[model samples]
Target: MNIFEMLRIDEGLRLKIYKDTEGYYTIGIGHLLTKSPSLNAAKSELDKAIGRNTNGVITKDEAEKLFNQDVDAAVRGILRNAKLKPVYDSLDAVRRAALINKVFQMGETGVAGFTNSLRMLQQKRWDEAAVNLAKSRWYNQTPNRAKRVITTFRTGTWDAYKNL
Candidate 1:
């Protein structure tokens, strides 16, 4: 409910010399190279940083700001999506947050592919949802993270990934 209580599952807090995704270099909480200041801040810096010669390299502070912005937008998007569910208001904070995190992690279509998981969520079958979440490619791509998220969805505990 407040910025103090909000958090994002961070993959890392460093800069990528080359394109992190698509064709633009990313750094500091997934901020793409196309952004301001980061786009041309350090024109000479990272000049030969990577294949694309990523420029406008930003400081950790700047990246932190970018991360906050990205998370805020993601939170807004997730909140809007949550309203679509009939059970949204009744669901406890943990389950709602876990669902939002899932949406942020896998994206819309990727989450959509979790037919069984989504069904389990709708039915409030917590354990079944966890099992379904574990049996997916996303789990293979990320074990610790996926397990932690699944654990939260299954048990509605905050400790699974509480540090982040």
Candidate 2:
């Protein structure tokens, strides 16, 4: 599958406002609305972005559109990270998608905390990078997803998603 499809599976669609695992107000397949001033402001931002009056519930089409926009932001965030750009550009599409998936789950700042892992990735040390991936709270917080992402980084292939 492509990056969009891969992320769709990883981040399931949610039409209504809900608290994420981190207790942040999230909606529309992982679009973080926490940066807004308040919950009401967050919903308003979502409505403006989707160009509709969702009223706390969005259609599947609107969700898909929002997901696309979220992915775009994630991709941009990844590339905008000066330290990560070279490493990101070195990988093939599959691995690149894996990186994007990570940024989707955790914002660029969160991902940027992985100094060792990013270094390993920069050096093309796949196994070492995968090892470093597990050496974090993120790995413990989301074991299943983290394992898949680590495998993708290590194998440089789509095998991680093959069974899903």
Candidate 3:
């Protein structure tokens, strides 16, 4: 990795382990004194970059950087390999942005489960795509988000609250 890339990753490794009440290497977010660990993994090339011991802290902006990188990568691959390539390609700027954003959140494999939804969008079967999305387990888990995406597909617009 070049210095520019490596510099950002410097903070990526987070330490879940901390000093607990019993002073054991603690774990868990929010609540301390969590469990599980054989302890001691071999140092890979990563240890050489360490300036100060994280002691297992999620140090720096590593977490955010990883999140950003992964999201763009996920969307990028989908755009390249998407079955509904023409539909994605032909969409206007707003539509394209929303579609990519929606797909990015789900990841590639996750979006694959919505085969019907993709076909519907490809065929310009807007209503069917919305209905198909509503019927998914993803919709059941996150109705508001699902509705917004579905509405965007159905109505060809992006609005957080106006799923009409």
Worst ten in a row by lDDT for model 1:
1-10
Q: Against the hidden true structure, what lDDT does model 3 obtain?
A: 0.52
Q: Against the true structure, whose TM-score is highest?
A: 2
- As a whole number from 0 to 100, the lDDT of residue 129 in candidate 2 is 89
Q: Residue pairs in steric clash, candidate 2?
A: none
Off by over 4 Å in 3: 1-60, 82-84, 161-164
**What is the per-residue lDDT of model 2 for residues 11-90, given as tens digits with 9 covering 90 to 100?**
77788888777777778788877765478887787688778787778888887877888899989998899877887988
Task: Using lDDT, rank the candidates from best to worst.
Answer: 2, 1, 3
TM-score of each: 0.66, 0.90, 0.57
lDDT of 2: 0.84
lDDT scores of the candidates, listed in order: 0.60, 0.84, 0.52
- Candidate 2: list runs displaced more than 4 Å: 35-41
Query: Which of 1 and 3 is ahead in TM-score?
Result: 1
Pairs clashing within candidate 1: 41-56
